[PDB]
């Protein structure tokens, strides 16, 4: 318990910043996560032995897909860690615990295919979960792994707190279904401007955590441009495989998933930044002013994609 995880100097410092990249060294990612849990929650919130066992079963249940992999899990968790650490007093004890775990688990057993593709393929998950298909699966994998012998990191919580934390985690993971983001942000924006936003309203808190989850999930757009640009490669590698799989079902995929339409990527990124990314971090910055660096970094990347179109790169 006097066993404080410590990172090298450069990582100790830069891990505090929104734009931190967790690096190419897979074997340091558990240690980075534990460090963040200890700083964000306490060395007391989880039994080190159980927490490490939990982390290593979660890693095992992420697949070797170009984008929706273990590195994405730990990147999304780091973004949450920066939000939480910049908004210390805004969050309950149960929230701080649940949200880092939710972010680590949020794409558990992802196959590199959209909810759309599962439904058109007629995958059994699509029959089990009519909406937020993969997101209900991710939550289910999280509960399955928490129920493994020696893996219940929540063991010391009361029956009450345990149901509360698993309910935070469930809502947090469902919110990562981008189909639900658009409405969540509209409501949050309306609420904020008519001055009805009330962080004491549990239903309001839910919506604000939902947006956090979108912001953390989309955080590749808030990195330094060379990170942003190389991550886009990984994202499109998955989309274009999906597109291929659509063509095998006899379905012309949307252009974003068609590798024949690679040329249209820069214009595609503009729409995404304008319709999703920029509104997400704006509404977030309005609700949580210390998250302004995400909006700033996002705007910088919008500017790099504009330059790519102008053939300025
Ligand atoms: C509307 C195109 N689209 C959804 C999309 N998504 C992302 S992240 C992402 C991953 C999976 C999703 F189901 C949704 C979003 C992007 N990052 C850079 N360009 C992008 N375009
Ligand atoms: Mg997901
Ligand atoms: Zn994700």
Short structural description:
With 313 residues, the protein is an all-alpha fold.
List the keywords.
monomer; 313 residues; Catalytic domain of cyclic nucleotide phosphodiesterase 4b2b; binds magnesium ion; binds zinc ion; cAMP and cAMP-inhibited cGMP 3',5'-cyclic phosphodiesterase 10A
Give a structural overview.
This protein is mostly helical and 313 residues long. Helices cover 64% and strands 0% of the residues. The protein contains 14 helices and no strands. Helix 11 packs antiparallel against helix 13. The longest helix is centred in the last third of the chain and has 24 residues. The chain is globular and about 55 Å long. The termini are far apart. The site of zinc ion has 6 residues, from helix 4. Magnesium ion binds next to loops. It is classed as hydrolase/hydrolase inhibitor. Keywords: phosphodiesterase, hydrolase, schizophrenia, HYDROLASE-HYDROLASE inhibitor complex.
Rg over CA atoms: 19 Å
CATH superfamily: 3'5'-cyclic nucleotide phosphodiesterase, catalytic domain
CATH topology (level 3) name: Catalytic domain of cyclic nucleotide phosphodiesterase 4b2b
How would you sum up the major sheet?
none
Task: Give the helix level as a range of percent.
Answer: 55-70%
Number of helices: 14
* CATH level 1 class label: Mainly Alpha
CATH architecture: Orthogonal Bundle
Shape: globular
Strand content: under 5%
The sequence of SSEs as H and E is HHHHHHHHHHHHHH
Task: Count structural domains.
Answer: 1
Structural class: mainly alpha
